[PDB]
């Protein structure tokens, strides 16, 4: 079947089936220009049994790129432009078309915290302030909400959207945690006002939670309070990410990070999505326990590793990093086929 993704209990209902899901991150899927490369990648993700793919919903620039290069929005002090041409949001339209054909669902964030593909910094270049004043910078927020409308109105009645996501890893370093609570509240109310069919979430890493062991990710240095955020009425589920190598923690600390977040989601009466994770060293050994904790903890609705890697008919490989799990590799067998088989 094909219906809108909803929540039943503290699980997701995807095409009429209520139960845990596995998915993957494919930020780069959104920028593929050859339709055959979106088709082969989505064929592989679907035939692997994954149900949800997270793709970027942004590609922000301050200067127009070399002719032929993809860009979705040009941010300027004197008038910004949202690109709906063939080198713009039509590349994301094909990703949604292919998700519909392959019975896949998509999580789509609207801005990056980080400067990759522009991010908050491309708004600060156009509209002044800095990365923490961005949240209440009227000109930057007015353009951000114009871009949110331009993306949400294309797919608001498509059954292939799993959830809209306010941003990738929003932080407010050193800020009061109320700055992101009030921004997330207002912006998720706005997204609900444009689309009543789809779920909405924040896209944060889950930093700031007092039920942990006091490591830096549980403290409040990055402007986020997980328990305050998941209680926002217009956010339907919580997200959290996990990178012990970057965070200075050991890999086994990841299980308690999953458990504490899951319990905070369930205390708020909602599901959690373990939305990104990776280990740079020995990923099959170090990430498989995390997948089993997530599958077996009440409050979790699904998990998505960072990240899918694939290769195309002409012999080119996709973008990648040290966390890529290449389709058909031995790490794919360990972290994708074995995990889908455990779920069902
Ligand atoms: C960002 O701007 C605000 C307001 O001027 C200021 O209070 C804060 O210190 C600035 N951040 C940095 C890192 O300078
Ligand atoms: C599209 O979805 C909106 C709810 O977000 C609904 O009001 C509208 O009727 C739907 N459009 C069609 C053509 O069904
Ligand atoms: C994937 O592996 C199978 C062998 O297990 C092979 O039949 C198929 O051609 C491979 N797919 C790609 C895209 O290489
Ligand atoms: C590191 O993690 C915890 C501290 O959070 C410690 O008790 C545990 O023994 C260590 N585990 C490994 C395998 O390093």
CATH number at residue 189: 3.20.20.80
Distance 235 CA to ligand 2 centre (A): 20
The catalytic residue among 169, 222, 275, 287 is 169
Distance CA 236, CA 241 (A): 17
| Ligand at shortest distance from the CA of 197 | 2
**Bridge partner list, 40:** none
The enclosing H or E element of 256 equals helix 253-267
CA distances from 160 to 24, 44, 108, 164, 196 (A): 15, 17, 11, 11, 14
Give the range of the structural domain holding residue 238, as residue numbers without chain letter.
1-344
Phi-psi region of 64 (alpha: psi -120 to 50; beta: other; left: phi over 0): beta
Q: Is 276 a catalytic residue?
A: yes
Residue nearest to atom 13 of ligand 2 (CA): 157
Deposited resolution, Å: 1.5
Residue for token digits 């590793």? 305
**Bridge partner list, 308:** 325
Strand runs (DSSP E) across the chain, as ranges? 6-8, 11-14, 17-18, 21-25, 52-54, 60-61, 73-74, 81-82, 105-109, 161-165, 199-201, 238-242, 272-277, 300-305, 308-309, 325-326
**Bridge partner list, 7:** 12
Residue for token digits 């326990």? 289
Task: Please name the method used to determine this structure.
Answer: X-ray
Number of domains in the chain: 1
| Ligand at shortest distance from the CA of 329 | 3
For 332, the token pair is 């794919």
Strand duo 17-18 + 11-14: pairing: antiparallel
Distance 335 CA to ligand 4 centre (A): 23
Q: Is 169 a catalytic residue?
A: yes
The catalytic residue among 165, 222, 276, 287 is 276
């Amino acid at each position: 079947a094909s219906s809108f993704v909803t929540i039943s209990g503290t699980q997701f209902n995807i095409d009429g089936k209520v139960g845990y899901f596995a998915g993957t991150n494919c930020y780069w899927c959104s920028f593929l220009t050859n339709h055959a490369d979106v088709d082969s990648t989505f064929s592989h993700i679907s035939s692997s049994g994954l149900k949800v793919v997270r793709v970027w919903g942004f590609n922000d620039v301050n200067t127009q790129p070399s002719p032929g290069q993809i860009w979705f929005q040009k941010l300027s002090a004197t008038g910004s432009t949202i690109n709906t041409g063939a080198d713009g949001l039509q590349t994301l339209d094909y990703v949604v078309q292919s998700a519909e054909q392959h019975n896949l669902k998509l999580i789509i964030p609207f801005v990056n915290n980080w400067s990759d593909y522009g991010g908050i910094n491309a708004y600060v270049n156009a509209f002044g302030g800095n990365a923490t004043t961005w949240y209440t910078n009227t000109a930057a927020q007015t353009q951000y909400r114009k871009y949110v409308q331009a993306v949400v109105s294309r797919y608001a009645n498509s059954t292939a959207i799993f959830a809209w996501e306010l941003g990738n890893e929003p932080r407010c370093n050193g800020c009061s945690t109320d700055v992101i609570v009030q921004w997330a509240t207002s912006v998720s109310q706005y997204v609900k006002s444009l689309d009543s069919n789809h779920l909405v979430t924040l896209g944060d890493e889950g930093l700031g939670l007092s039920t942990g062991d006091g490591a830096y990710p549980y403290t409040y240095g990055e402007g986020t309070d997980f328990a305050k955020n998941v209680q926002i009425k217009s956010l339907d589920f919580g997200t959290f990410h996990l990178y012990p190598d970057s965070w200075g923690t050991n890999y086994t600390w990841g299980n308690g990070w999953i458990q504490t977040h899951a319990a905070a989601c369930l205390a708020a009466g909602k599901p959690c999505v373990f939305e990104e994770y990776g280990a740079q060293q020995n990923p099959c050994t170090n990430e498989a326990p995390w997948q089993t904790t997530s599958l077996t903890t009440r409050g979790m609705g699904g998990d998505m590793f960072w990240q899918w890697g694939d290769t195309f008919a002409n012999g080119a490989q996709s973008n990648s990093d040290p966390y890529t799990v290449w389709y058909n590799s031995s790490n794919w067998q360990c972290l994708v086929k074995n995990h889908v088989d455990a779920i069902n």
